[PDB]
Design a protein around this ligand. Structure first.
Ligand SMILES: Nc1ncnc2c1ncn2[C@@H]1O[C@H](COP(=O)(O)OP(=O)(O)OP(=O)(O)O)[C@@H](O)[C@H]1O
Ligand SMILES: Nc1ncnc2c1ncn2[C@@H]1O[C@H](COP(=O)(O)OP(=O)(O)O)[C@@H](O)[C@H]1O
Ligand SMILES: Nc1ncnc2c1ncn2[C@@H]1O[C@H](COP(=O)(O)OP(=O)(O)O)[C@@H](O)[C@H]1O
Ligand SMILES: [Mg+2]
Ligand SMILES: [Mg+2]
Lengths: 48, 495, 42, 188, 467, 161
């Protein structure tokens, strides 16, 4: 049971990663940049 | 499966503003970093590949950072992030029973280390006021070590000998024997063993952990393995990690025991680390620093007085001497740092006399102090008798001379022992009593081993009341002596 | 963001989990080898 | 010895020593701006194919180098500081690494007037509206007197997110490291 | 002034000042520490940069910290208020009894006494140790050295000397434990508290203690010796009183100097040792002298690395001592203790006009016979003693008797041996060795002499063995 | 020489391939070309190698004695790579003969000297311990199989220290 389940999980991660790498191929870059800039504002405010 | 998805969430993905530097040149295990303007000395910077390094040199234009892994995972141009803390390690009773590497990263499986406190590997030893004389006994469970060359709590004995003379075996028996104390009622006799494996085959440590788990001895042991393959800056650091995991107990009122195995393979890792920094080699190519390296490490095996918790940290460095040269560089460097020494001859070992302690040269400079009174009574006589036997064994006349020879041979046969077979203190007292008072001078020497075994199986089965009396009252009273004499005489009769 | 991305990637994988998904012959071969090793040691 | 005035930023190496000497020379007499002008002019002069090829040959007497450099520094009426610097480099034989020297000085001048450099990396270009709001936020990091000196850049390797460098500070908003962190968390 | 750190390599910190530099040997305080970290200047690199040796752990030093010049070298509290206290290199008390409240401070880098101040008077110091008294009589007011490998007796012997000499002394005393165990220092402290030598509730203490034990960085170990020399120089000069000064282990001074001399950018000398080994040792050992103002009796325990007396460190220190005492592992492995080697120990007062003629003649006869036996050992080890002339057999018997008789049981070694510690007066020693040489004891066995005091006990033990 | 080293090696190869089904690798580090050819032909004669019917029990890897040090210090790793395949991706036991193991350390020493590293105690590279460890620590019995290494040893100057 241990062997089969751990190998199952390893393959789980392998393909999940390989496919999220593909799924990053959308056109949401604007949202990511907006969130990053907001977090930059947060960091700047905190660091002074 | 959904367990893994919970494993996803709760991870810290928050981004922070962190200082950074750029690697300039990695090679010989020392990276040069550019930037890191506000980096402390001996800080722990982190490379982009998950590695770690100790900021070693703060030169005006760059930082020499020693990598704690394989320098093939470091480019030129990588990013080095300072973690803003002198080299730390996780400490606590959460590590007990865990095999952590030189940095506290569990190499065990069995989940991660759930530690909540961190120490500095580069701390300082306790001064002169906190320490107090060694008072309590550290029971090794080995007849020769416990009778002739005893050890105390706070002492830092040395185990020195050649290849395959039973140094790791003595260490493992000492670790195993503490099982009985680590089950009793009082937290004052519990010893929390540690075992640092430096430059040792990984299979050896795996089998050692398996053995310690067979003997139920992992409930309190921590194994800090920086094995043969691991980069030199990890074998150099492992002793300090272990010593910190032990200093935690020492400073929180508990008692610890740390076994560095070997320290002759940390000094080799340090010599590599130095010659690759171009430092000027000295005697045998060792840097002149190769003393401070061990002195600072072994000066932490202290024994804090009662105004400082009362804890303690015994240390059992294991040195290995080529061709049994006790006068080499590192063996003498360490013989002048420690409070005792146990020489494991390689010709006594080849005679089947195991463990091969060479009682002529072995010594413990706290010795009689911190020894159970019963063992003191029984074993002072053994020390004198063995001395006399040694004085004369260079030829093999009168009654006294032959008496010395016979008694000495009997005692030698009596002090042999088997692996993973530690003996309670009272059992050693009983055996050495039957040996020294002279209830064995007629039995053939070759049979002295069999007798021993049989005798134990008797005393443990029948007269456990007397042994409990000896254990509780740590002394052989007159009535106890008489009962023990009766037992020995009666048993010997039926033989 | 990426936490939600991982969440939904797992959702859309499990939904196509009528067993081990896109494994291949190596799946069965390695599993059989491991099982037979267990048999040899058991 | 004299008390050379320490430049704001410290550089190291032979380049840095010559640059520090020149900066302390100019700072006294308060000739930094003009000295930088003559330096960035010798920057163009020394790239001249004839001079560039002549100054790299080691088989022309050093005195020939110094004479030629005095000729080419008298024509442009360079401040005495720059002429002395070039004569010094020719005497010592370091003019082969003049571009490192003058470049260093440029750096050592930027840090003087507050041009705290920055650098932004992304997987695509940036809309001038987004870039302008980015500049406005980044300006909040600095202190009074300092002025941002942004430098956009592009890498394909990092999927999304963004990477920001502000002098020494460094924030990796990229999605590459986020993905790696998640993968480590869901492995370990 | 005020400089700023610009490099930190091991225990060597390079600092930069914009105003005037501090002259070499000054002390500097690293401003911004949780403790007191003193950096002592050692070089002037140029560019208003100095290179300093840190007298404490340099972990946590950020390139660009602020360093503040003191203006004078390291200055320690000296005076009669240091008696019974303990002190680190920089003179802070480390015994937890409040500050050392003295009136007058002393800089640890003073100059050696000038040639027009040296005293010349020589006089024997009787220690109660048979071999030391007979073959290498110590001189009162002169440097003394105990050369030993690791684990041979240097410290048990220096403790026996402490006991015998100091407890029977009128003047003050200083113990500068440099680069040695910390538990040994604690045991010595708690063993002088119980002897009344140190007093924690009065002003009748006689011993000052200074400690640079082996857990300390190289910077501290290389300077605690100078702190001891200063605390003793004061009692020598500003009191005009006889001082005793024990140092253990003085080889750590030079070893630490060499550990922190690769970083100073020097070309390493013979065996990796610093190029300045001899001069660094000289500038230290030349302040430990008896002069016309006072009298320091120094007992220094020199470690001999890897049991090599031709090593540069002991080889160099051999020229700074009046009386040497070479403890040897070969003898100690025979069980003889103290392991002193009779044919390597020397003294400058082994003169028939200083120790008389009977003493000198007995000592030289002992050495002659021991040397003859040593010459025989080469043959004896192969062709056995059955291949020697009769005079040679008799010589070997006498030599073995003498080798044993030189062994003595010390008071401080009761815990080891159990035997009772003995002081053998000088006349008893001379008499016993004179008798053994004459032949009055050719009938006793060798072991009758092993670990006995005066020869009366040897005769008594020979009587015991005969029954 | 002259004692039966090659015949013993061939017998071990044969028996382990016959009583266990596990193949063998022979990494001739610093191998004389004459001796390498002689070993090849002895094996072909003795059947452990077979040039016709794809039933050979040995994989020979040869780092000859006339190759730059950079190539004699790596051939042991080529042998270990082949044997590691036979252990992990075919789950069996393996023999790994290393003749000689001294020439491995010597090749490492020359490479380190060429790169410009301070020689250690007796001229050996500073990284001798870990150079030996990285190689010797891949010859172990994992949970898929095992590599058993037979390492011919030369003792310089009859000096075991
Ligand atoms: N008390 C003992 N009785 C019998 N055999 C022993 C004893 N102690 C050790 N041995 C045997 O000695 C061999 C090696 O012992 P051990 O590994 O403890 O020595 P070592 O010095 O640790 O070797 P190394 O240091 O090279 O690992 C083992 O086969 C072990 O069984
Ligand atoms: N006079 C003596 N009598 C008996 N044993 C001694 C004597 N001197 C030294 N020894 C033994 O030799 C050991 C050497 O220890 P010590 O002399 O204290 O350290 P060092 O290595 O600095 O000389 C002691 O622990 C003791 O067991
Ligand atoms: N078991 C054996 N039976 C017969 N001859 C043997 C045996 N073992 C070794 N020999 C002989 O010893 C000689 C040694 O040669 P060999 O071992 O093949 O090369 P090397 O001497 O290089 O090891 C062989 O020629 C062989 O004839
Ligand atoms: Mg072992
Ligand atoms: Mg000592």
């Amino acid at each position: 049971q241990n062997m089969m389940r751990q190998k199952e999980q390893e393959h789980m991660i392998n393909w999940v990663e390989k496919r999220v790498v593909q799924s990053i191929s959308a056109q949401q870059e604007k949202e990511t940049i907006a969130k990053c800039i907001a977090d930059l504002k947060l960091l700047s405010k905190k660091a002074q | 499966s959904s367990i893994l998805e919970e494993r996803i969430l709760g991870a810290d993905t928050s981004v922070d503003l962190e200082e950074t530097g750029r690697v300039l040149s990695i090679g010989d295990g020392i990276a040069r970093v550019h930037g890191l303007r506000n980096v402390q000395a001996e800080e722990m910077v982190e490379f982009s590949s998950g590695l770690k390094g100790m900021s070693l040199n703060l030169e005006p234009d760059n930082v020499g950072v020693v990598v704690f892994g394989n320098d093939k995972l470091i480019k030129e141009g990588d990013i080095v992030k300072r973690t803003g803390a002198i080299v730390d390690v996780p400490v606590g009773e959460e590590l007990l029973g865990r095999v952590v590497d030189a940095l506290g990263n569990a190499i065990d499986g069995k989940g991660p280390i759930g530690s909540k406190a961190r120490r500095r590997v580069g701390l300082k030893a306790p001064g002169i006021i906190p320490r107090i004389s060694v008072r309590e006994p550290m029971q090794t469970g080995i007849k020769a070590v416990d009778s002739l060359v005893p050890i105390g709590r706070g002492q830092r004995e040395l185990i020195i000998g050649d290849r395959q003379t039973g140094k790791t075996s003595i260490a493992i028996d000492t670790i195993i024997n503490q099982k009985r104390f680590n089950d009793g009622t009082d937290e004052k006799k519990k010893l929390y063993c540690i075992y640092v494996a430096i430059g040792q085959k990984r299979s050896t440590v795996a089998q050692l952990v398996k053995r310690l788990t067979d003997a139920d001895a992992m409930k309190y042991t921590i194994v800090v393995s920086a094995t043969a393959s691991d980069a030199a800056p990890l074998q150099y650091l492992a002793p300090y990690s272990g010593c910190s995991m032990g200093e935690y107990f020492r400073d929180n009122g508990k008692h610890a025991l740390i076994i560095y195995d070997d320290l002759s393979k940390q000094a080799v890792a340090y010599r590599q680390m130095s010659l690759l920094l171009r430092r000027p080699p000295g005697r045998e190519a060792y840097p002149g620093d190769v003393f401070y390296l061990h002195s600072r490490l072994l000066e932490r095996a202290a024994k804090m007085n009662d105004a400082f918790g009362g804890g303690s940290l015994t240390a059992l460095p294991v040195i290995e001497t080529q061709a049994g040269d006790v006068s080499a560089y590192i063996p003498t460097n360490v013989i002048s740092i420690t409070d005792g020494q146990i020489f494991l001859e390689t010709e006594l070992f080849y005679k089947g006399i195991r463990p091969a302690i060479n009682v002529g040269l072995s010594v413990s400079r706290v010795g009689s102090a911190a020894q159970t009174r019963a063992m003191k009574q029984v074993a002072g006589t053994m020390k004198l008798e063995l001395a006399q036997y040694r004085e004369v064994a260079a030829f093999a006349l009168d009654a006294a001379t032959q008496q010395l020879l016979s008694r000495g041979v009997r005692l030698t046969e009596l002090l042999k022992q088997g692996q993973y077979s530690p003996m309670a203190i009272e059992e050693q007292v009983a055996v050495i009593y039957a040996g020294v008072r002279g209830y064995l001078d007629k039995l053939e020497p070759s049979k002295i081993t069999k007798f021993e075994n049989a005798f134990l199986s008797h005393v443990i089965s029948q007269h456990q009341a007397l042994l409990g009396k000896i254990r509780t009252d740590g002394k052989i009273s007159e009535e106890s002596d008489a009962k023990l004499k009766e037992i020995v005489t009666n048993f010997l009769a039926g033989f | 963001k990426l936490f939600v991305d991982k969440i939904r990637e797992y959702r859309t994988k499990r939904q196509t989990s009528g067993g081990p998904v896109d494994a291949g012959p190596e799946y069965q071969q390695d599993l059989d080898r491991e099982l037979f090793k267990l048999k040899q040691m058991y | 010895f004299a008390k050379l005035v320490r430049p704001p930023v410290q550089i190291y190496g032979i380049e840095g020593r010559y640059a520090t000497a020149l900066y302390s020379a100019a700072s006294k007499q308060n000739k930094l701006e003009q000295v930088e002008k003559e330096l960035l002019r010798v920057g163009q002069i020394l790239k001249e194919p004839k001079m560039a090829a002549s100054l790299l040959n080691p088989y022309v007497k050093r005195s020939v180098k110094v004479k030629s450099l005095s000729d080419m520094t008298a024509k442009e009426k360079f401040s005495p500081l720059t002429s002395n610097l070039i004569n010094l480099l020719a005497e010592n034989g370091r003019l082969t690494n003049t571009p490192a020297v003058i470049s260093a000085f440029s750096t050592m001048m930027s840090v003087h007037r507050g041009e705290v450099p920055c650098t932004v990396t992304t997987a695509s270009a940036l809309d001038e509206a987004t870039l302008t709001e980015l500049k406005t936020v980044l300006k909040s990091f600095l202190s009074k007197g300092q002025v941002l000196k942004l430098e956009v850049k592009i890498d394909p390797s990092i999927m999304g997110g963004m990477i920001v460098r502000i002098g020494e500070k460094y924030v990796d908003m990229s999605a590459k490291t986020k993905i790696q962190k998640l993968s480590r968390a869901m492995r370990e | 002034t005020t400089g700023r750190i610009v490099a930190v390599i091991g225990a060597v910190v390079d600092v930069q000042f914009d105003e005037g530099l501090p002259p070499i040997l000054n002390a500097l305080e690293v401003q911004g520490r949780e403790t007191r970290l003193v950096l002592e200047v050692a070089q002037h690199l140029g560019e208003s940069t100095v290179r300093t040796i840190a007298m404490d752990g340099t972990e946590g030093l950020v390139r660009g910290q602020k360093v503040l010049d003191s203006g004078a070298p390291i200055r320690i509290p000296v005076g009669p208020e240091t008696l019974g206290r303990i002190m680190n290199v920089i003179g802070e008390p480390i015994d937890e009894r409040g500050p050392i409240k003295t009136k007058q401070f002393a800089a640890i880098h003073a100059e050696a006494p000038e040639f027009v101040e040296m005293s010349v008077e020589q006089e024997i110091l009787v220690t109660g140790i048979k071999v030391v008294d007979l073959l290498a009589p110590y001189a009162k007011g002169g440097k003394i050295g105990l050369f030993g490998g690791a684990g041979v007796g240097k410290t048990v012997l220096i403790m026996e000397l402490i006991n015998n000499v100091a407890k029977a002394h009128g003047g003050y005393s200083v113990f500068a434990g440099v680069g040695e165990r910390t538990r040994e220092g604690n045991d010595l402290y708690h063993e002088m508290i119980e002897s009344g030598v140190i007093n924690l509730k009065d002003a009748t203490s006689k011993v000052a203690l200074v400690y640079g034990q082996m857990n300390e960085p190289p910077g501290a170990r290389a300077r605690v010796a100078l702190t001891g020399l200063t605390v003793a120089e004061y009692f020598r000069d500003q009191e005009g009183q006889d001082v005793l000064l024990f140092i253990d282990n003085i080889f750590r001074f030079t070893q630490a100097g060499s550990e922190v001399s690769a970083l100073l950018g020097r070309i390493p000398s013979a065996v990796g040792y610093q190029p300045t080994l001899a001069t660094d040792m000289g500038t230290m050992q030349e302040r430990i002298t008896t002069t016309k103002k006072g009298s320091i009796t120094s007992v220094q325990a020199i470690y001999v690395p890897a049991d090599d007396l031709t090593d540069p460190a002991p080889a160099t220190t051999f020229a700074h001592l009046d009386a040497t005492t070479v403890l040897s592992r070969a003898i100690a492995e025979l069980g003889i203790y103290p392991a002193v080697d009779p044919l390597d120990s020397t003294s400058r007062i082994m003169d028939p006009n200083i120790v008389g003629s009977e003493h000198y003649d007995v000592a030289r006869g002992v050495q002659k016979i021991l040397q003859d036996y040593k010459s025989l050992q080469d043959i004896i080890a192969i062709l056995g003693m059955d291949e020697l002339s009769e005079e040679d057999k008799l010589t070997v018997s006498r030599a073995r008797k003498i080798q044993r008789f030189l062994s003595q049981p010390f008071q401080v070694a009761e815990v080891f041996t159990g035997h009772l510690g003995k002081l053998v007066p000088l006349k008893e020693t001379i008499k016993g060795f004179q008798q053994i040489l004459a032949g009055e004891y050719d009938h006793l066995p060798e072991q009758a002499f092993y670990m006995v005091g005066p020869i009366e006990e040897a005769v008594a033990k020979a009587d015991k063995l005969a029954e």
